[PDB]
Amino acid sequence: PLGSPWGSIEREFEELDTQRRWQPLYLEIRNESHDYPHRVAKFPENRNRNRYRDVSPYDHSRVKLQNAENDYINASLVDIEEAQRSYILTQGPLPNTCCHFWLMVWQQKTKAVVMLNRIVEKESVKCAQYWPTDDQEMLFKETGFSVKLLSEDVKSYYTVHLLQLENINSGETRTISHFHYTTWPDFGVPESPASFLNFLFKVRESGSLNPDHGPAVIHCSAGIGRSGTFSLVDTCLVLMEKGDDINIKQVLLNMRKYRMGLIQTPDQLRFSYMAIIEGAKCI
Numbered sequence: 189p190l191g192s193p194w195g196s197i198e199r200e201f202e203e204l205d206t207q208r209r210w211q212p213l214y215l216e217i218r219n220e221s222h223d224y225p226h227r228v229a230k231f232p233e234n235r236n237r238n239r240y241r242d243v244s245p246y247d248h249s250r251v252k253l254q255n256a257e258n259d260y261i262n263a264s265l266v267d268i269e270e271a272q273r274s275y276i277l278t279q280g281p282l283p284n285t286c287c288h289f290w291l292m293v294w295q296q297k298t299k300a301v302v303m304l305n306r307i308v309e310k311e312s313v314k315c316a317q318y319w320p321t322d323d324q325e326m327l328f329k330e331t332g333f334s335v336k337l338l339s340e341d342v343k344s345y346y347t348v349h350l351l352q353l354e355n356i357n358s359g360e361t362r363t364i365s366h367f368h369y370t371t372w373p374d375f376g377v378p379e380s381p382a383s384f385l386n387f388l389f390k391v392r393e394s395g396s397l398n399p400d401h402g403p404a405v406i407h408c409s410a411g412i413g414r415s416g417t418f419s420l421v422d423t424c425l426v427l428m429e430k431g432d433d434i435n436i437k438q439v440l441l442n443m444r445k446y447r448m449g450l451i452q453t454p455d456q457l458r459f460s461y462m463a464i465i466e467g468a469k470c471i
């Protein structure tokens with residue numbers, strides 16, 4: 189019907205809820221996702237650059253650190269040509285790879301970092317503290333960068349930090365928008381579709397995903413579950429601009445050719461449908 193662009197997805201959603209097919213649908217996606225080479229991730233010299241041995245970027249889509257003796261970072265370039273959307277999905281940096289993370293942000297001309305995890309979750313560190321929390325500058329001498337906190341905007345479910353990234357050697361500075369969603373549990377879902385959508389709209393409204401910036405850097409802990417959920421919702425909502433009925437299963441499988449394991453639970457998949465539907469209604 190005319191005023192209901194979400195109609196076909198909403199009909200799918202109710203159909204999958206009624207037949208309780210979220211778990212089998214999720215298994216279909218897992219079964220139909222195919223492996224791709226990830227040899228560089230497994231080189232012995234990169235062992236301490238990977239947070240999890242199980243989560244590796246594919247060789248054909250890894251982001252390379254330029255002008256580096258070792259060019260490896262656990263980060264994947266995920267692009268969806270039909271949507272003209274590109275993202276870098278990456279793990280939460282380790283203490284020894286925070287310098288590589290900022291070098292990547294600089295070289296890729298990234299304007300926004302979307303962080304979907306807490307530093308500490310369930311008595312485990314999921315990500316190093318890679319930006320400063322007070323007025324003291326954080327120095328990454330390995331790669332020649334310093335980060336300063338410029339401002340902090342704390343809301344109920346997320347915080348926005350404005351960071352000043354400076355190339356120490358060149359003297360150039362750039363302001364990075366650090367969008368920190370703080371109420372999304374590991375392997376879980378956000379507090380509500382509404383709270384997630386306000387966060388996503390804030391990222392969109394900022395201008396940080398404009399084509400004249402490099403791709404935004406999206407991360408959680410491993411960079412696949414929450415990062416993949418966030419990416420799928422934004423991408424599908426962009427695809428909906430063209431007015432065709434969209435196949436969410438296929439969009440996700442296509443995204444999974446760029447980075448393994450995007451969306452980690454049947455409930456994250458179900459949340460994805462819900463946020464696309466409620467997001468289309470909001471718009």
Ligand SMILES: O=C1CN(c2c(O)cc(-c3c[nH]c(C(=O)NC4CCCCCC4)n3)cc2F)S(=O)(=O)N1
Nearest residue numbers: 240242374375376408409410411412413414415452
């Ligand atoms: O919703 C989400 C979920 N995420 C997420 C994540 O947190 C972790 C992992 C992962 C993959 N391998 C291992 C791993 O070997 N852990 C070992 C286990 C036994 C030894 C002691 C602790 C260390 N952990 C995969 C993910 F998808 S996410 O991608 O951050 N977003």
